[PDB]
Symmetry: C3
């Protein structure tokens, strides 16, 4: 059985405008980085969304992109990940790991006002969930990828209360993948066998 090597990048970030992916995926090699609305294309610690083009872009998205500003600072201390709102506008985070910690609904979206920060991920909690997931079968273990994913919207909120009901309805959002947790999940997933119900070649 297989070999693992420590991820060179602790996370990857994908930017979206509504339901469309925009720009290349950003890979973070440093423990602290900022996703902002500016234009430096060569800072390994900055994912600058302002330089990303989209000929198909609409006015609402353009308008919102102008308010990203300093955006969000993403960093980790030990086994915990945080998101700090550097922007003059708030950011909205949907983190299953965070939501479960507070007993909130899994799809809960938490508002992080300017100047505030939130613990979007805790490894201990994830490791514990992963450990108990085995007794649930391939089914539950496979779905844990969602716990390694965190989505955040700049300026516009979505979900309960807000008119916008889904992340794809927001003008500017990012999707963060925590690579360490994903590798941890892989070590378990590869030993959980295959699904129960049969998937034919024709249906």
């Amino acid at each position: 059985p297989v070999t693992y090597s420590e991820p060179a990048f602790w996370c990857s970030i994908a930017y979206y405008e509504l339901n469309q992916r925009v720009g290349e995926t950003f890979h973070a090699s440093q423990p602290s980085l900022t996703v902002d609305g500016f234009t430096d294309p060569s800072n390994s610690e900055r994912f600058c969304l302002g330089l990303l083009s989209n000929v198909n872009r609409n006015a609402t998205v353009e308008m919102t992109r102008r308010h990203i500003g300093r955006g969000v600072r993403l960093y980790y201390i030990g086994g915990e990940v945080f998101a700090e709102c550097l922007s003059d506008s708030a950011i909205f985070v949907q983190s299953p790991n965070c939501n479960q910690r507070y007993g909130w609904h899994p799809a809960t979206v938490c508002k992080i006002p300017p100047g505030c920060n939130l613990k979007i991920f805790n490894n201990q909690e994830f490791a514990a969930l992963l450990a108990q997931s085995v007794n649930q079968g391939f089914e539950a273990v496979y779905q844990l990828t969602r716990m390694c994913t965190i989505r955040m919207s700049f300026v516009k909120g979505w979900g309960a209360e807000y008119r916008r009901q889904t992340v794809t309805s927001t003008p500017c959002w990012i999707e963060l993948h925590l690579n360490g947790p994903l590798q941890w999940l892989d070590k378990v997933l590869t030993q959980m066998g295959s699904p129960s119900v049969r998937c034919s070649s024709m249906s």
Copy 2:
């Protein structure tokens, strides 16, 4: 005239869900790799499709992704490339190079049941076809890029017999590009001149 340097990656692989590209392109630097449905984001020998997100994903695709499992092993011995079905579900391959070898229709899709393998490419055959393609003109030489491309679907078949008629109708498939052959083709294409029928700036 120009200089060539040996490709650092023998192939590139693009993943798709129906007619939409999902995730970044994978580049293989090792002679053997596996494309599976798991989640390690840091193994140079594994293209793990399970960690790839798609907020726009439908139930059929999600369902099928759960059955990719160990997926397919792609490797080359000398000038020959093979695909082995490690998955508990079959994979379906459409390789023009393979199809021609057996006299099958160019768009033929070959089923590779679990545990089986198929020679999806042979360089000698390609080189020979390329050599005779010159007498066919820019036309035939330009179309040889198709010979350097191989498409494979996980779990679901397509083409003759199956309901699904095109690769874009399958939930999860990959597109492999053989870089050595592409460079070989380039050396010829750059010397084949331009098309015959005129392409205006207005039509």
Copy 3:
């Protein structure tokens, strides 16, 4: 305040077919490169569009791709960038920096016939515009990203005179980003504060 490091790549190039992005972004590390319709996947000085696949491609695009040929040579001398038409078919360039230099409309598209070249960018002019942009506010400075972007179509023209009115209506085009200018803009943008009109979390 922040640190900048010289860009390892002087520019990035994105290829499109109509309104759809095709292929990975190309990053240039050498002062001279060519974007052609051929197939070498391993030359750091060549962005070969001919090897790029698109299962969703239409006949018009396929037809045009066959006429890209030697394509366009993009290179810089000092602080000036040029585009040379190596292709047997013309290329059409939309460069705000070039257009302003000649007093043409910002969206003007300039035809570069085979064998001809055009100065698509001049840093002195941009730096001067950037300097005066400050007195215009965040508004005008933010829009300068457009000056760092240049779009070019192969074979087919668009805009005034031609039937095609937008770049997204052309079969094969590229989008060039000048990284040095973008970093220069960043140094100013980060000091221009935030927008005037308020952007709420609900609208």
